[PDB]
Amino acid sequence: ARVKRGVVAHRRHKKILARAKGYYGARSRVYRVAFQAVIKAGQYAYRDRRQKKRQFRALWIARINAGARQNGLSYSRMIDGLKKAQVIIDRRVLADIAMHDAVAFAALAEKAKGALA
Amino acid sequence: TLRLNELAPAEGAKREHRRLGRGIGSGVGKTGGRGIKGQKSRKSGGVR
């Protein structure tokens, strides 16, 4: 039962090289280099699934800060005031309202201010 | 139910042989259960 390694080996190399399209030089042509390139890409993607949620929350907090400082507060005091008024809108929606609807955001800032005083 | 097509052995009577040196996912890959760098890691390694 002599077994030849021609078809399965060729298909494995082919599948690894099909996942390396767009890479530069030997990284999309040479199996040894493309294999390390695909593994490192998977590692990077695993770590950036975690980092994406931090980056987006930082962006929401910055936009809410910009919106609150036009209404007379800092981010800290608006978030504290909204928590003291039992408003539970999260930051993803607050940043949306800051970026698209200035009147409703002024209403929210007034509610927070009233809660603080 | 009686054909050369339809005869199976009892459950738990056959096992696959253990195969060393066939990749990472097997658990018996690189060194094949022998450790690192001793007399017992050599070929014909046991002492009398």
Partner: protein, 103 residues
């Protein structure tokens, strides 16, 4: 008409006719669900903010179906330690369409 609703542990800002994906639901494809824990309603210089809920506000939606997102590949590796591991993932979702917002 811009209401704010809760679903699947997250919050959404919806209008009428909008189609959106949320986490998997137990409801049946073709049924009708109703969100009656509404957080804010804006109808144009008329703004109802819930503390934490707007009292008599309703949002109705229809279940179009259930599906899976595209495949994600998880790869764990430890360099110089003889350790590699791989996995696949597809996440489930329910597709809703917004029918009415009461206010």
């Amino acid at each position: 008409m811009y209401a704010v609703i809760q679903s699947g542990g997250k919050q959404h800002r919806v209008v009428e006719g909008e189609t959106l994906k949320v986490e998997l639901l137990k409801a049946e494809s073709g049924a009708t669900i109703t969100f009656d824990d509404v957080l804010m309603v804006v109808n144009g210089d008329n703004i109802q903010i819930g503390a934490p809920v707007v009292a008599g506000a309703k949002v109705t939606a229809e279940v179009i179906g259930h599906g899976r997102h595209d495949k994600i590949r998880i790869i764990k590796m430890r360099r110089r330690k003889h350790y590699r591991k791989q996995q696949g993932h597809r996440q489930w979702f329910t597709e809703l369409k917004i029918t009415g917002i009461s206010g």
